[PDB]
């Protein structure tokens, strides 16, 4: 906390200048360490100010007003720093009360495809910088993949659902600006096998712990062992998990082998000893007869006859010495074998029941990545890890849509308008859209720049749902192809009554087969109403899309009965089922790092497109086609705050281009 808290809650190192800061302040960062601290302080302090009160615009005046000497002594610096921050949506983004009502006439004109959060976020900024902004949206509502089901008092999201921690999350600021009811999610998650019975704490804990052990293992294969290509194909996470489980099975056997191999080594030292013992009890038997016969010769006897008795006597006790030392040895081994035979190593690596619960953990992962682990990149699936927010995940109790809708306020949004063609050239762009309702009723939009926020599922369609004229450069279309666009679905169950443990937010269900680990594997209790929400992940996700709503809600009830009793589970009053892969304005749910891709492709996605010149030999043009969206933010893919940020990013980059960058001197 302090000014350093701000830096952090703004995703920036508090005592270092960033790459994007060096870009606009090369004079400072290439200069003396003393000025850098002033910069960093002015930056951090302005942030704090904006953050402490994100409901009202923060102006250059108000900023200098609240600064101290020696910091408020140089006012060009303060002005640059403040201008920079404003431009890149670090201060004054979202929904604030503007002090200086909007500058009367606008400069430049931007068409924005899609009113997802990335669109909306960018739109607002552009408008704030005084540009002419218009959004084209194919749907009859805003918010795209932030969808929210409403009916009566029932409220459930079919899209984004969780705020993944406020620590550094832009959505932290947005929630102070907008009434979202933010409820903590309690970490506890009971599983329930196919039969209907809790997996017991002993197992529950030892399968999980193996799961986590198994992830770390794959990471070790990747980074330390370099196991990343396999017959030219790049290795997936799925493959790697198999290769690790195999090597764990192999070693389980490897152990058994050398354990029994120790029994035969010892059970066979025994054999050789008993052979020696049977052969001694033999010579003893016979030597006794001899000595017996020598004592039958009654006295008086001569000396050799006396010697004989005496000799055979010694000879016999000597051989009774040995067969006594051997019974000693025999006694050692004989027990050193009840040793080994009593503490056997592990029977199996994981049983069928075990392996089935591990599958639910993999379902968890296939849900988190919205895809079959066989599609994820081993090296990179978790490349976005360092940037995780801190603090408890939350849900939006009043429904997530509440946020798009808030942001859409004051904006030129054309709903039911499906872009079909984007035409960009050295002098400008036209966008050709149609009316989704009567699809021959055509529209044309002329602008300085297009911000494209099409979902990557959309950008992938073959054959194309949107045509680029001219076609996008191969570097971009290869990024589109390489990248992964997964799928994940929701079933909403609306009841007259809570029949579940009200103090539990989520409870798993374990499938029967690997093939179906995804199917209704998880259930959420989040809302004020009695709604229950069930995920359909992994391979199951895509196959369940081709199945009727009834059948789905069937298997849902089935499972719940199993867990709760065949008559605590009423008929559901209202039910909904998401089908994201089939939804033509999404074509999927969110992106993942596919095998063969990397985080760098996300950067390729965000790079703007610059047309060739009109008259050949004319100067290099301005860039015209820009990109935002969840698939374009390397450090925050697949999320709301991620899209939001990418929106801010482009808004800045467009304004720098068309309204010019006064602050860089």
């Amino acid at each position: 906390s302090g000014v350093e808290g701000a830096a952090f809650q703004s995703r920036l190192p508090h005592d270092r200048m960033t790459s994007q800061e060096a870009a606009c302040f090369p004079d400072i960062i290439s200069g003396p360490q003393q000025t850098q601290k002033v910069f960093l302080f002015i930056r951090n302090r302005t942030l704090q100010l904006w953050l402490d009160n994100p409901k009202i615009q923060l102006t250059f005046e108000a900023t200098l007003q609240q600064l101290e000497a020696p910091y408020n002594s140089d006012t060009v610096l303060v002005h640059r720093v403040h201008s920079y921050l404003e431009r890149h949506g670090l201060i004054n983004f979202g929904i604030y009360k503007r002090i200086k009502p909007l500058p009367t006439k606008k400069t430049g004109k931007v068409i924005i495809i899609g009113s997802g959060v990335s669109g909306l976020a960018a739109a607002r900024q552009l408008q704030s910088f005084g540009m002419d902004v218009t959004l084209l949206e194919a749907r009859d509502r805003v918010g795209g993949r932030v969808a929210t089901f409403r009916k009566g008092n029932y409220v459930a999201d079919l899209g984004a659902m969780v705020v993944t921690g406020l620590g550094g999350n832009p959505m932290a600021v947005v929630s102070k600006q907008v009434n979202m009811e933010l409820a903590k999610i309690k970490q506890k998650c009971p599983l329930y096998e196919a039969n209907g019975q809790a997996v017991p704490k002993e197992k529950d804990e030892m399968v999980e712990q193996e799961f986590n052990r198994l992830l770390e293992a794959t990471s070790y294969l990747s980074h330390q062992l370099d196991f990343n290509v396999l017959n030219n194909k790049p290795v997936s996470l799925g493959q790697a998990l198999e290769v690790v489980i195999q090597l764990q099975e192999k070693h389980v056997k490897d152990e058994q082998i050398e354990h029994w191999k120790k029994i035969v080594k010892t059970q066979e030292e025994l054999k050789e000893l008993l052979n020696k013992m049977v052969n001694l009890k033999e010579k003893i038997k016979e030597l006794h007869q001899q000595y017996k016969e020598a004592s039958e010769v009654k006295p008086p006897r001569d000396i050799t006859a006396e010697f004989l008795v005496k000799s055979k006597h010694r000879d016999l006790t000597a051989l009774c010495k040995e067969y006594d030392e051997l019974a000693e040895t025999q006694g050692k081994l004989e027990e050193k074998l009840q040793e080994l035979e009593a503490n056997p190593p592990s029977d199996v690596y994981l049983s069928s029941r075990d392996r089935q619960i591990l599958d639910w953990h993999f379902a968890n992962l296939e849900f988190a990545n919205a895809t079959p682990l066989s599609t994820l990149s081993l090296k990179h699936w978790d490349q976005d890890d360092d940037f995780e927010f801190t603090g408890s995940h939350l849900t939006v109790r009043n429904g997530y849509s509440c946020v798009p809708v808030a942001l859409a306020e004051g904006l030129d949004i054309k709903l039911n308008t499906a872009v079909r063609q984007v035409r960009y050239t050295a002098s400008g762009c036209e966008v050709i859209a149609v009316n989704t309702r009567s699809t021959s009723q055509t529209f044309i939009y002329k602008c300085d720049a297009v911000l494209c926020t099409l979902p990557l599922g959309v950008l992938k369609q073959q054959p194309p749902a949107v045509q680029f004229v001219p076609p996008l450069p191969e570097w971009k279309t290869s990024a589109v192809q390489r990248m992964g666009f997964g799928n994940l679905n929701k079933v909403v169950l609306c009841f007259d009554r809570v029949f579940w443990d009200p103090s539990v937010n989520l409870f798993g269900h374990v499938g029967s087969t690997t093939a179906s680990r995804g199917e209704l594997f998880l259930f959420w209790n989040l809302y004020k109403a009695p709604i229950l929400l069930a995920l359909v992940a992994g391979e199951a996700a895509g196959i369940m899309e081709n199945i009727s709503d009834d059948v789905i809600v069937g298997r849902c009830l089935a499972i719940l009965k199993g867990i709760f009793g065949s008559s605590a589970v009423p008929q559901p009053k209202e039910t909904v089922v998401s089908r994201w892969r089939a939804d033509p304005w999404a074509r999927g749910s969110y992106s993942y790092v596919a095998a063969g891709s990397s985080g760098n492709d996300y950067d390729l996605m965000a790079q703007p497109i610059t047309p060739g010149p009109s008259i050949p030999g004319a100067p290099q043009p301005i860039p015209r086609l820009f990109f935002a969206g969840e698939h374009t933010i390397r450090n925050y893919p697949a999320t709301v705050h991620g899209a939001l940020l990418s929106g801010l990013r482009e808004a800045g980059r467009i304004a720098d281009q068309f309204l010019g960058a006064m602050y860089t001197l």
Binding site: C189, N212, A368, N369, W381, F389, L522
Partner: peptide, 9 residues
Amino acid sequence: PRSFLVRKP
């Protein structure tokens, strides 16, 4: 991505 995982350690 990872952060969406239920039951984090």
